[PDB]
């Protein structure tokens, strides 16, 4: 794979793919294009070619598949932040643990 970067700077997603699962075709798209703008790639869920998996624990409880340990699954924040600070944050800080949060949908009760 031939590259074309003439600089001492590197993107927060350099040679790193990000998969989004849960967000709406709209919210997701935005992320897909973004990844490229920053300096990374984006692939459809399932493709093992993906290195990182960003799942929305807000509306997602369990993954539709059983990924390997190699794949680092994190929350949605991880992706966002990294972009805001333009720096690859630590997955151990956004590691997705099927964390189920309250008020998932209808708050009123």
Curated annotation (Swiss-Prot):
Known post-translational modifications?
Phosphorylated by PLK1 in vitro. Hyperphosphorylated during the G2 phase of the cell cycle. Dephosphorylated at the time of cytokinesis. Phosphorylation at Thr-101 is required for its transformation activity in cancer cells.
What is the annotated tissue distribution of the protein whose record heads this document?
Answer: Highest expression in testis. Also detectable in brain, kidney, liver and spleen.
Q: Copy out the induction comment.
A: Up-regulated by phenobarbital in the nucleus and cytoplasm of the liver.
Subcellular localization: Nucleus; Cytoplasm; Cytoplasm, Cytoskeleton, Spindle; Cleavage furrow
Q: Which parts of the sequence belong to the BRCT domain?
A: 8-96
The modified positions for Phosphothreonine read 101
For this chain, the annotated S-S bridges are: none
Quaternary structure per UniProt?
Homodimer. Homooligomer. Found in the centralspindlin complex. Interacts with NR1I3. Interacts (Thr-101 phosphorylated form) with PARD6A; the interaction is observed in cancer cells. Interacts (Thr-101 phosphorylated form) with PRKCI; the interaction is observed in cancer cells. Interacts with PKP4; the interaction is observed at the midbody.
Read off the domain note. The BRCT domain 1 and 2 are required for the intramolecular interaction, but not for the intermolecular oligomerization. The BRCT domains negatively inhibit its GEF activity in interphase cells. The same BRCT domains may act as a positive regulatory motif for the completion of cytokinesis after the breakdown of nuclear membrane during mitosis.
Q: What does this protein do?
A: Guanine nucleotide exchange factor (GEF) that catalyzes the exchange of GDP for GTP. Promotes guanine nucleotide exchange on the Rho family members of small GTPases, like RHOA, RHOC, RAC1 and CDC42. Required for signal transduction pathways involved in the regulation of cytokinesis. Component of the centralspindlin complex that serves as a microtubule-dependent and Rho-mediated signaling required for the myosin contractile ring formation during the cell cycle cytokinesis. Regulates the translocation of RHOA from the central spindle to the equatorial region.
Q: What is this protein called?
A: Protein ECT2
Task: Say which species the protein is native to.
Answer: Mus musculus (Mouse)
